[PDB]
Design a protein around this ligand. Sequence first.
Ligand code: CUO
Length: 382
Amino acid sequence: AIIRKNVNSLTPSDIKELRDAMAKVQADTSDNGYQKIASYHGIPLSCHYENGTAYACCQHGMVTFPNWHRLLTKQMEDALVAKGSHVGIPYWDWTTTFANLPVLVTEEKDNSFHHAHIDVANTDTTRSPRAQLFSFFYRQIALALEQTDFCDFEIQFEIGHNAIHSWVGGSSPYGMSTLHYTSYDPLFYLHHSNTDRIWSVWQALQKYRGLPYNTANCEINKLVKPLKPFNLDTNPNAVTKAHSTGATSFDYHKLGYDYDNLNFHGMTIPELEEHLKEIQHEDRVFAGFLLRTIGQSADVNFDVCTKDGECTFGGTFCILGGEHEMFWAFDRLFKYDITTSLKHLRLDAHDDFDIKVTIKGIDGHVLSNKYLSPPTVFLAPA
Ligand code: CUO
C-alpha cells in the first residue's frame, strides 16, 4: 500500500523523488501524462452528451463528488509512482491553521509543484491567494464530520472544500478558482489528497459509530452509474477503471493507498467523536441554503440583520463552477451555523430578523440574487 502523508512530515528524499517523478509525469505526452490526466477534470472538455455536446467531466454538486475525485487523485498518484515516486500524493491539511501555502508548492526554483503548463491554453497556471485564506475551515469541516448520513456529510464537505479552490486561485485566470483550469495547478492534488483524507476520517467515524461507511442508502441511484471517463476502455489505469462506479469507490483500501494516520486535528477517532458530541449539547440556529448550478464560480457572503437594520457578519461559502459544467442541484440544504451572529445582535431564535445575501463572481462583480433562493432558518436543539 502506497502511503499518503502530511506534506510537512516529508523527508528531503521524499520531496526530491516527488519533484522528480512529477517532472517526468509533466513531460510525458502519453495518456498517462499530466495534460491528459488533468483534462479529466475541466478543459479540454472530455465528456459528451448523447448529442455530441461536450461537458467537463468532474462531478460537483452531487453525491458522487467525493467518489469521482477519489479516482482522479488516484489516477495522478499511479502515474507518479510509475515515474519513480515511492510515496503517494501527500496531503495538505488545510483545516489546520497556516500562514502560507506549503513550501513544496511555493519554491520557484526547480520545483515541478510550483506550476504546470496548460498546453491547450498556452500558459502556465496562476495562483492569487485571497487574504481570507490565511480556524474557519476547521469549523466548516467539523460540521460535515458531525453528520451521520453520507448525503448530509457530502454537501457540507464539498462546499467546505470549494473554499480552498476559490481563495487560492482568486481572480487569477488559470488557477484553482476555475472549474476549467484547477486540475493543472499541482496544489490541486495536495488539496484533493487532503479532501480524500477528510472523507476517510469520516468513514472511520462511521465505522466507530456503527453506521454504514462503505455504502450509502441515500441517493441510491447515482451511486450505481459509471464515473466518466474512468469507466472508458481508453482509461489506461486498470484500477480506477475497475472501481469506476460510485458504488465501487467507497473502499479506498482497494485502491492501493493509505494515509499516515486519520488523526483529525491531533485527536484520535474516538476523541473526535466525543468532541463532535459536545457540540450537539448546545442549541444552534442554522441558515440553510438550496444550491444549484449557476454556470460559474461564485463566493457568497451574508449578514444577519435585526429588523431595525443593525447587522453582523453571518458567513461565507463558495461555489466552484464554469461554463459547460454538467447540471447540478443539491437535494437538501447546505447548513451554516449562525448561533453566534444571533447572540451578537442579541436576537432570539424566534425574533424576526433578516439574512442579507451578496453573490459575487470571482472577478468581483455582483451576481443577481436570483441565482439563490432565500435561505431558511431553523433551530437544532441540544
Ligand atoms: O473538485 Cu473538481 O475540484 Cu475540488
